[PDB]
Symmetry: D3
Subunit: 155 residues, 6 copies
Amino acid sequence: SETERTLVIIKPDAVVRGLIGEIISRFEKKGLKIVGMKMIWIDRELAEKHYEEHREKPFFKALIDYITKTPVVVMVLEGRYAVEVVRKMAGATDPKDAAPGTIRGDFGLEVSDAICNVIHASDSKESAEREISLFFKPEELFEYPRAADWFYKKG
Amino acid sequence: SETERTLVIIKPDAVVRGLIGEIISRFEKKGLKIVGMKMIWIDRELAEKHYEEHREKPFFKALIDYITKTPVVVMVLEGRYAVEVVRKMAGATDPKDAAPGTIRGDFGLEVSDAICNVIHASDSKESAEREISLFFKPEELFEYPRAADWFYKK
Amino acid sequence: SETERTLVIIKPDAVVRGLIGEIISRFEKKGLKIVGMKMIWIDRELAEKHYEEHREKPFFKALIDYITKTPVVVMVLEGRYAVEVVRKMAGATDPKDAAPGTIRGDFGLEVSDAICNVIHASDSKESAEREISLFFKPEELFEYPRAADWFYKK
Amino acid sequence: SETERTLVIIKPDAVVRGLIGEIISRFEKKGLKIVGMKMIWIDRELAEKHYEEHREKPFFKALIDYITKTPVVVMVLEGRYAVEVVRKMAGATDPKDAAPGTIRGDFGLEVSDAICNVIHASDSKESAEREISLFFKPEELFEYPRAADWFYKKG
Amino acid sequence: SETERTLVIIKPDAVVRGLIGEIISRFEKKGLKIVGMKMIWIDRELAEKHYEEHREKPFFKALIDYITKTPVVVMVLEGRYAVEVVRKMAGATDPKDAAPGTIRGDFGLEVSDAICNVIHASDSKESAEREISLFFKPEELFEYPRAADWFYKK
Amino acid sequence: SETERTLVIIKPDAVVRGLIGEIISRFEKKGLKIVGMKMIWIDRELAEKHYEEHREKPFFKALIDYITKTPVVVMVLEGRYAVEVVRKMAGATDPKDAAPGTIRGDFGLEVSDAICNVIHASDSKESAEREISLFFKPEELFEYPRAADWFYKKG
Ligand SMILES: Nc1ncnc2c1ncn2[C@@H]1O[C@H](COP(=O)(O)OP(=O)(O)O)[C@@H](O)[C@H]1O
Ligand SMILES: Nc1ncnc2c1ncn2[C@@H]1O[C@H](COP(=O)(O)OP(=O)(O)O)[C@@H](O)[C@H]1O
Ligand SMILES: Nc1ncnc2c1ncn2[C@@H]1O[C@H](COP(=O)(O)OP(=O)(O)O)[C@@H](O)[C@H]1O
Ligand SMILES: Nc1ncnc2c1ncn2[C@@H]1O[C@H](COP(=O)(O)OP(=O)(O)O)[C@@H](O)[C@H]1O
Ligand SMILES: Nc1ncnc2c1ncn2[C@@H]1O[C@H](COP(=O)(O)OP(=O)(O)O)[C@@H](O)[C@H]1O
Ligand SMILES: Nc1ncnc2c1ncn2[C@@H]1O[C@H](COP(=O)(O)OP(=O)(O)O)[C@@H](O)[C@H]1O
Ligand SMILES: [Cl-]
Ligand SMILES: [Cl-]
Ligand SMILES: [Cl-]
Ligand SMILES: [Cl-]
Ligand SMILES: [Cl-]
Ligand SMILES: [Cl-]
Ligand SMILES: [Cl-]
Ligand SMILES: [Cl-]
Ligand SMILES: [Cl-]
Ligand SMILES: [Cl-]
Ligand SMILES: [Cl-]
Ligand SMILES: [Cl-]
Ligand SMILES: [Mg+2]
Ligand SMILES: [Mg+2]
Ligand SMILES: [Mg+2]
Ligand SMILES: [Mg+2]
Ligand SMILES: [Mg+2]
Ligand SMILES: [Mg+2]
């Protein structure tokens, strides 16, 4: 099946700037389904677990302080090739390099010791699965129809 | 204190139509702070506790079917006179009577056996307290600064 | 039945200013269904039939010049109490008196010898019937499901 | 003259999802002039005529069912190099590949047996001319000034 | 003549929150013409002249601190009955009482010792004249055609 | 420091079309700070000085008539790598070539004898400095905090 689920994190800079709604609307408008979502305040341990692949990098500590600065909104998006699609929508890691039209391209620029880039998106199906597990329990993910779902059925 | 918290529910019709982000943005743009939020699927038992005041009304059952139709997004908004403000932003219960500019006025219209109207908003500080305890534990509510908070402090 | 159809005309001033899409979106977002629509260029004869009720008024001629100035977009919107709802969304006849949030309130202001106000909306179910027959043949009106129609059915 | 006319079809998925207005606004905002437009319900014959170049392709039947599923909004856009411009605005055929900022990039993703991609745009001046003829009579296309037209006159 | 000019000030809270463009767009979309505009940083002396009518009120000092907190954008809007129209678009002085759809209604809420409300708008043609002279020289005010001006001329 | 200031001009076509607000919002949303701004009516001399590098080009005269046609809004934007960032946001010189999502890509298309492209952005730090000087006096540029400035401080 082409249907995939990816993990998205609306980072502290987006939350503080009041951009939660604008970001969610971009996914809803794209046709992606929100099967899970909640506002939480990530602590060091969970943050270092999510960003485990960067534990041995110079900017690690700044990243942890950044992602745990204020509450974030974690959510699981479901849809056709959702992982690559959401990555494309996010834009280049450093927002100054992100193309106009992408989330980072339109909303990000300024940075602290960490490259503040509005949101996080799983880079692969493998990462998505591992990441979704860290933030969501099966009981927090739902199966339900979005308005136009019936339109895409294959007779 | 003028700062108060209110409970908002982005109803199944809003979720299905993909209006979650647009509704949330209206509050963020107003200066309201999201101190708690999560997508959940309300069951009949919890729904009836929330809408206890309507238990004796003709539309009760249909209202419970409606609010439990699909998952919803429950959230707590904090800000100066948040309760009356959000109620004002929401608009009249029946979307056809809601003024343009309000959430129900701009997004609502069609109905089922229940009057579908995009969102729910606590009707008083007392009710918000009750409704918030119904959906959230203290550990799901947060205190943090929004970008412009410093501007208003003395 | 609460479902009714109303006739809307996106006037020459709206067309010239490039507001067709924005106006249409307001209706789509409300949950109203476009069951008919087309860009046409109304001539004096058809215009006078449409605005027959104003034939004896001082501003009649200027109103006919205005509505026939450039092409317009005539469309039929369907939905629960569509007539009064669209009228509500449109706002006061004179844009300066129209409330912010309404179409005339947000987009209208400047006038000519006619009170330019972005759009026209039928004033009753009876008038809509009459006006729709004036601009559309039955074959130009369609019945189809909008994405969320199923949500409201029992 | 650089002024060209292209044929645009707001396909059934966009109509059902209530995206007609948002799509039209993008063209109006770009400065393109709507010289013709109407909501119609395409039947098999007309659909197979419009997509004549794909009659011998595997996905043909799905495309015909798709484009004739519900009423559509056909319109003729006029403006400087309108054909290539509108194609660029549309984005890649498969919306998952369309760049953020384009119509398909922002609005499309899910597919049925046909690659549902929000809208159709003539691929060439030749196609535009042939396509405009299939849907519009000369009497349905108009010549009128848009607000800023006077600004671009060449003294 | 119905065409008049009014003075608007996009207050420090609006500037800090990055709402300058959104506020300006509301006026442009209404059909109002920007004939003058500039970012400046008002000092106490100029601020008190602008708000002279409030010199004897309890909130005077806090109002002067507020309007001089950060730079602001002062602009002159021209159009049919521009004064009452902009006042209508702005909404009630206290944002919590401002109707959804208005600028203060959609963007304002939080306050300091002064009632922070996004923008200032002249309350009469007479006051606008006075306020415009306070911030602009004749050479900073312009007469030019907006795209659709020709549509309204006879 | 990565913080730079660039000079932006909302050209006559954008002013006449009532696009001033929409353009400003894109920068504000990106996180760029407006440290200077004002509506002025550029005269020939100042225009030929701003576009000094094009004095020996065929389209020079058309450009001067264009940029001095109606009042414009000049503004100085401040932010991390603002010069390259704003250039990216502007899009390709000829708006028909500008990508969807960019200012020129979304708003520009039609041209007169000059390639009307909605706005102007300094092409380099050197140009920015020279251009800012032509339109703004030090007394018209301000230092003040934007809402989220505190969020990016490097502890
Ligand atoms: N070199 C860096 N310096 C500081 N912070 C960085 C750097 N690289 C990445 N970051 C931060 O760490 C996050 C994760 O890094 P990475 O996985 O490379 O980016 P991506 O979000 O595109 O997958 C980035 O989104 C950004 O928030
Ligand atoms: N008469 C009615 N028939 C069907 N449903 C109704 C009716 N009145 C209200 N409702 C539904 O019940 C919900 C709760 O009722 P009430 O508290 O009176 O409205 P509100 O949500 O505006 O406070 C309304 O939001 C609407 O969804
Ligand atoms: N007094 C007037 N002078 C000039 N034009 C007017 C006047 N009153 C109304 N109009 C124009 O005639 C149109 C039709 O009049 P009416 O039906 O009374 O208003 P409405 O369109 O709100 O139903 C109005 O929309 C407006 O365009
Ligand atoms: N391989 C495919 N499978 C299913 N549907 C397709 C496929 N390719 C194209 N389509 C559908 O047929 C339409 C026309 O095909 P084509 O001309 O190649 O795309 P375009 O709209 O970019 O010109 C596409 O827009 C899409 O709706
Ligand atoms: N009672 C008050 N306490 C504190 N500040 C106030 C009070 N009333 C008004 N203000 C502030 O003073 C400004 C000017 O007052 P006033 O002219 O009465 O309101 P308006 O700006 O709506 O015309 C108001 O916009 C608001 O910023
Ligand atoms: N070949 C041309 N013909 C007419 N006008 C042009 C041409 N090239 C550029 N222009 C106009 O002159 C302006 C400045 O030229 P240039 O610096 O090359 O573009 P840019 O704004 O991308 O730096 C362009 O933005 C456009 O307004
Ligand atoms: Cl990118
Ligand atoms: Cl949907
Ligand atoms: Cl209401
Ligand atoms: Cl904020
Ligand atoms: Cl009204
Ligand atoms: Cl729908
Ligand atoms: Cl693309
Ligand atoms: Cl135009
Ligand atoms: Cl009000
Ligand atoms: Cl205009
Ligand atoms: Cl580009
Ligand atoms: Cl900010
Ligand atoms: Mg990564
Ligand atoms: Mg209630
Ligand atoms: Mg009438
Ligand atoms: Mg093709
Ligand atoms: Mg006052
Ligand atoms: Mg240049």
